[PDB]
Subunit: 472 residues, 4 copies
Amino acid sequence: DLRRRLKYFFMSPCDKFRAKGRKPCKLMLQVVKILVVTVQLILFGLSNQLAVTFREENTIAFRHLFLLGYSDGADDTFAAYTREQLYQAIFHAVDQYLALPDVSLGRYAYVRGGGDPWTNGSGLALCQRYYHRGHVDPANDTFDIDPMVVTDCIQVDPPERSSYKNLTLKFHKLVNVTIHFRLKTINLQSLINNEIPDCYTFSVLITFDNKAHSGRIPISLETQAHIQECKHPSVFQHGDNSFRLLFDVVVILTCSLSFLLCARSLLRGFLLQNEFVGFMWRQRGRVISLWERLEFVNGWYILLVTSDVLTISGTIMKIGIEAKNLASYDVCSILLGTSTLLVWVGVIRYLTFFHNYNILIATLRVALPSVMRFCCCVAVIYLGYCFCGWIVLGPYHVKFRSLSMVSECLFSLINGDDMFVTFAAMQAQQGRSSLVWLFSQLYLYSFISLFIYMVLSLFIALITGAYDTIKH
Amino acid sequence: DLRRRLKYFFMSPCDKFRAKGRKPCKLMLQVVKILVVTVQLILFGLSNQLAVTFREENTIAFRHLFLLGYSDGADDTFAAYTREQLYQAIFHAVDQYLALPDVSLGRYAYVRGGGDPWTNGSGLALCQRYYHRGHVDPANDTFDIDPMVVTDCIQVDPPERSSYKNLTLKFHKLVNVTIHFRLKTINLQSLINNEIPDCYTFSVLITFDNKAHSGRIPISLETQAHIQECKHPSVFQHGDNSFRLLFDVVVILTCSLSFLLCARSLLRGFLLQNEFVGFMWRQRGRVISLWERLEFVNGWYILLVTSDVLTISGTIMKIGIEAKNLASYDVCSILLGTSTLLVWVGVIRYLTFFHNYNILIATLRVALPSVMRFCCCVAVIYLGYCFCGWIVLGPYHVKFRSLSMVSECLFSLINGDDMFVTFAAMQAQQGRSSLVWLFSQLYLYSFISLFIYMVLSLFIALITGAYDTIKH
Amino acid sequence: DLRRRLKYFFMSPCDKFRAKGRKPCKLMLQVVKILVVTVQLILFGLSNQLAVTFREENTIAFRHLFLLGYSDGADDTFAAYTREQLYQAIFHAVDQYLALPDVSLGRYAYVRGGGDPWTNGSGLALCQRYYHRGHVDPANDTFDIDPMVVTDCIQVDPPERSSYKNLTLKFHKLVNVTIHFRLKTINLQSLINNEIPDCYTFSVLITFDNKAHSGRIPISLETQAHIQECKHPSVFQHGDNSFRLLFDVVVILTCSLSFLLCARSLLRGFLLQNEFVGFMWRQRGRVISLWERLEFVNGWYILLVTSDVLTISGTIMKIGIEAKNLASYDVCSILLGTSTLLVWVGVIRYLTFFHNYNILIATLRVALPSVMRFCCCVAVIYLGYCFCGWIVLGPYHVKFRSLSMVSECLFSLINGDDMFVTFAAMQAQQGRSSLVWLFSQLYLYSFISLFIYMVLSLFIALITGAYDTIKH
Amino acid sequence: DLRRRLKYFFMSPCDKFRAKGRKPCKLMLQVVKILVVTVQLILFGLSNQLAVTFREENTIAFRHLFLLGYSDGADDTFAAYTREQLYQAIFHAVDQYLALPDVSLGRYAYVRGGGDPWTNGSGLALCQRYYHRGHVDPANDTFDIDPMVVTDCIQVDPPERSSYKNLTLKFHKLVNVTIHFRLKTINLQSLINNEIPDCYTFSVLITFDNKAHSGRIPISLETQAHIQECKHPSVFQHGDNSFRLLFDVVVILTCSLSFLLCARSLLRGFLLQNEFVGFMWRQRGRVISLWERLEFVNGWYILLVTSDVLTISGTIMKIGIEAKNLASYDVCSILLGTSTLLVWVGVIRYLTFFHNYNILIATLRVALPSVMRFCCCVAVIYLGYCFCGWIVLGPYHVKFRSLSMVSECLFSLINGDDMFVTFAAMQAQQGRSSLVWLFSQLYLYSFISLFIYMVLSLFIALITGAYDTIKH
Ligand SMILES: COc1ccccc1N1CCN([C@H]2CCCC[C@@H]2NS(=O)(=O)c2ccccc2)CC1
Ligand SMILES: COc1ccccc1N1CCN([C@H]2CCCC[C@@H]2NS(=O)(=O)c2ccccc2)CC1
Ligand SMILES: COc1ccccc1N1CCN([C@H]2CCCC[C@@H]2NS(=O)(=O)c2ccccc2)CC1
Ligand SMILES: COc1ccccc1N1CCN([C@H]2CCCC[C@@H]2NS(=O)(=O)c2ccccc2)CC1
């Protein structure tokens, strides 16, 4: 009765073909879906790479043009330690902004005031932020402070093809000094794709930051690009307009077809399951809390459904980005990359049809639960070690400041990396604190030994036991 | 008779609940103790982090302000090789100290003489130490020396809102030159916590050190902070005065309750044990030297007692530190971190109640003795290698100077780290000493091979044998 | 009948010697072939090393002489950011070319015009490439561009024992600026071999590259040597003319003899096989699709034949290179190195004659298929991870730009290398993109854990199972 | 008969004590020998360390004083690229030598002429070496060269408490330029030991090396110390004269006693063996080629004899060094370190008396032969890979120049070190040679995979099989 139905439902594709029904249509559909998803991802990645290089090189040029005394490397630890140093840095930034068209190797254009910092007609705004009242006096031990940041800002307007040299900076109340301006470029490098009308607008922010009030003011330069269409389309675009959008709609249609087929199959499985519980109610025998009624389901279809949902949701956003006003590449790239990862993991299913590959897969499937329980135990011990190391070695070593950093350092240590650099960093404070040095010796030796000579060996033992159980 | 008593004593908590007695009160007490200890540690660590950053940034500013020709990095290998170089360094330090209020980006205050080096009214003291009699003469081979360090010191007093330029430095008898001064700051960064009255006093020591008499005088700058209350309290402190001290007394009370409960339980175990030895004296049978009468004890209660002792002893010192005159963070942080590590290791006990986690724990408990015996053997071989490597490769390579450094280098080598850097450091003296180069080749190859291909494999074999014994 | 024939065919060499036939002639021929191939490779490698050092040192001297502001290291990140910077770099290059004979520490000679860039009488040609029409205007959003690179070039002729200072560089249309010149040297270092008439001609190309149009123009110096005979032979060459060519013809003859013997043996095996299929047709029994009729063959003879083909094909090209007009060392070195690798792998055959070494070899031969199937599964998962990591972490981290680079980074990570450097590189953008930072944490932890604690353990399990099957 | 004798000969020390004979005299003698050898090694190492630091710091001071434009680091890649650069370097060296007493921070003394380069009265000799006849002409392709190095040298005599500025350097025939001078110092740092009369004499050699004739002349500074007694002894030496020599003679006597006891024991074993072969000749039974007659011997006594021979031979040389004219620390340190390594390995013998440690030792003793046979096979494959990698990647990457360097790089790669740095170094020439880049990809991936996933797994399998055989 239901015997033949469940037989066919649990048959492999080859035995299905042998018994009844036509060829592996869904299987070759999934093959072509793998192909189109990978090709789409590669096409997206090449263009993103070629635009990221342009953005980075323009930022490097901006740093070398506007930061005084800047040299490659040293992007951190670039600061000011003297009032004249800070004044010279600020005045150099503003003078280079005013001299840009005569000295720069690129071609930029000024942007007149159209936002919050820039008033009408101004292209650069240097704004300083201080406290409304501050009477810091390290002598007599009195400060008399009320934090309410006041902003006093100057606007500099550029010339066409003074009043900032009178800046007084209020060093004892200063919070930060910032410089805002914008520069329009044209990406001529886009003559390979012939999609040249990439017509950027960089927003440059130079920050002189005085939060810590340490006498050391770090200096930074961050930028933000805003891509557009540079009012000159369809010179070579007649041949490339159709290809990208047609490939995107092909991907969307293939993934929607895959989703509908897998939904049909999952509904079929659900109905067969509910038939089985009823007919087992008929004889009313071997029933338990029924956790295996969930084992009736097919996990590969769940994986496939998730992958096509992610693929179509990311392809919609890619369509929006590459032509329309969508500017959010992070989420789109995360969606597309996760979908491609899942699509490529879904080949393990085509490998479990053959006996030997199925042995190698069943070994891991059998070993996984013990691995996760051991991961619980090791989790708790490793978290204790992370807390102890953070709290003790934080004040002395910069690799142990954040909990994320101490976690990364320990995870690198249990795999053999930066081990002697860590040990030497600890060695560099023996004279400062012999007690902390001795604690660091005990801590590092104990942790590395316990986690390399006793935990990884047990992971190996678990996997080997699983392999032996499978091969017998 | 005693059968039911020992039954209940050795029952698990679930079977205890099933047989007689109320709920796991001690177990949930230990859970809330884990929680409060971890939260206290995190609260302490955040504030220590935020103060250590301030101290470090002020020290960096001091180095860049007072050391002549100083650049980031190069904190070692910063020295002087010429008399005019040393004179210019000293005079630059003193001139920057005198010019600080006009040039510094921070706000500091001078400290008039109140200690040993500083006489009345002086803020800076540059003191040179030489020998009482020294007639070093490399020619004729005569030195005629009697070491008795004499200190000749100058005091410079600062001005308010000369006599050191006449320094003669006695280069052939010099031991060191030092510069001592103090600077008062106010930690305005403490406006997040609103606990702003952190009103430091840095003690800066600039050392020109001539111990080796090599013609190379290294120059260093060390500082020491002395936190205080800056005579302006209770502006926002009304809301934060109670929270920290209340949390500390809550931790103290929870840990004292835990300690008393575990002491009750350990006394119970002792009395049951002494009852067992007597009733076994009654029948007078299966008695040996009685090492298992100690196996009657519960190690988890020992761990818990140690952890609460450490926690309360460290919380008392934290209470002393954060408000009173206690300034010793090293011991307090070590105590708190060790207590948190032990408290988080104490969850393994809650995992050994279930069968599968108990298998994973019993495997390690069974494998530990063989691991420690193999560690004895490997100890002796590794110590021989450390001695040989130190004595032979010490004179040529700086990674092999100290016994602690050669031990760290070898422990990193047996785990795959800095291996090629070590080999290349050895390669860099083939022309100097072919014999030492060949010895270093043999030494490094032999050690790494013997310790990677024969010792770690035996650790794996021990753990795998233990796992197989447990699973059968 | 055929029983004795197949007995002798499958006998080992020792049992062959015991039963019938003379000594291991082919085996000792292969031994002397190993010897001569290794000696030839070493002789070739020493001379290539000694010439590569000369080429590299001349290129370093060229960089320090012609690049303005160049310092060791910094071979990348050497660029120009200002019009005057670029002009000064170009003029410094040309002035140093004109001043070379008075300032250089080597001895070079000028090469008058004999090629495409250099017209008659000119030694240096500085050529700039721009667009035929370009109206880039970042303001108003208009570019009006048609890419057709026009080359405007200047020729500078050197003096014997002006007109380039009038260069205008067209910065808004520029593609690149190049400088071409040649310099003749004589390798006097070849007085050890006494093969001194190495009389080079370096072609130096200095590129000022403006592809990205970023405002940052990287500057590079590449060279190309062209070895010759410097019209002064046979001063010491009478003793060294014969040795190299005689050794090369000895290698050729030995490898041809080896090839002919192995071809005889393979034909013998083929004829015995075709006799076996016929006589099995006689009784007409245990026949299948006959995959073992291919197992009749000897793989070691295939390896040997390939190795002698590669050796003779590379020795012909080495003969051509070292005296004649052949200048292609890459292919010759690849051929010779592959042939030497195969010749040294062919000793495993001499080890499989003894029982214990044969056990160690048969273990690997039995474990190889499972290893390759697991490599298929791991291939697909690892490729999914590579695609996801490239697409997501490409825009932010330079180790993830190319697919080859992300593959190398992941392959290094699963073996414990640059792990914490990767983690810290990710940490450096938490403030920029918390979302990408969290994704990178999940990604790296998941990948390293899955590939270290579950895949390598299964490789170990496969090899251990194979060893246990072999030893029983 | 002989049964009781062989019983006692093969008894353990505890069973010997139980059966007949007094206490473990030889065993506690070996314990005190371990102690004295380790203490002697430590005492030697501390003093060698403290003198090596002085030598190194004086060399650093010499480099910073005499090399023009020298900065810490950059000890390689320090060269000259211009005639005026070389002239200025030479003249700066000589001027600093003449100005030393007025500018140096150490105290040095001039050494008048008493050797080969220095004639009478001269302290510094700058000598240039060129060819007797050289007509290098890169144009016309003619060199006309006969190598016969002629030395033209200048002598500069120092003043007391010109003619080198007229140097012409013959740049087209130059081989090298050298500068030789000596400086007497006094090690005042030896006031801790009070063994102050360490009265050195540094021989400084500054080499301007032009072997390659590349236009790049590297510049180096090497020194050589010559310790002496500085004509002022026995000021504090009355208390330290006896201790070192008494400890050295104690070590010599202890090691000679150990050697004589072990020689007695080995002769005893030989005589018992020769008795056994005779009495087995009596019954004339179970005799073979008799490899076990050598198994009659005790390897621990061989190890001990070698260790005491090395210890006494190195202690004689240490006695010679620390007071007499012996100046060869390399051989002495090698002897002492090897003897200490052997003495500390000799504790494994005291561990094999107990059953569990003996199991852990017997596992390794049983696994060693299979390990060595697998090492033969892996040897041959790894040597093939080394040859191929050297010959192919030598011309492009500096880590692959020497066979020793490629061997160190590969041995580091199979253990997970500098793997991504190697891969990136290869990546840096994709544009230069795509073919060599592709070969390097195949080469590195193949090697690392074959050696990590197939060879170390087999080492683990061998050790695990040995452990299982021992535990059953
Ligand atoms: C794909 O997941 C895995 C897949 C296969 C095996 C293990 C994991 N693991 C490791 C990955 N995760 C770690 C992330 C970083 C910190 C939190 C976890 N460290 S841990 O539990 O103290 C730890 C430390 C050493 C060894 C085993 C666990 C936790 C699951
Ligand atoms: C938590 O302790 C452990 C826990 C689990 C396994 C091993 C240890 N070990 C290793 C940690 N300790 C080492 C500290 C540094 C020097 C002294 C010891 N090195 S060793 O005995 O020559 C050595 C060298 C290689 C492998 C095994 C021992 C010694 C106990
Ligand atoms: C000599 O070949 C081998 C010999 C012996 C064992 C394994 C291999 N392998 C590893 C070498 N090859 C890799 C090259 C780089 C990327 C492509 C392959 N990576 S992988 O299949 O995702 C992978 C990742 C981790 C472990 C096992 C496979 C693929 C065959
Ligand atoms: C104490 O000796 C050992 C002790 C215990 C195990 C192994 C060795 N080995 C390794 C040490 N020696 C190596 C020196 C460098 C080059 C020559 C040899 N490399 S290898 O035979 O290709 C090779 C490569 C990978 C794994 C195993 C052998 C060769 C004996």
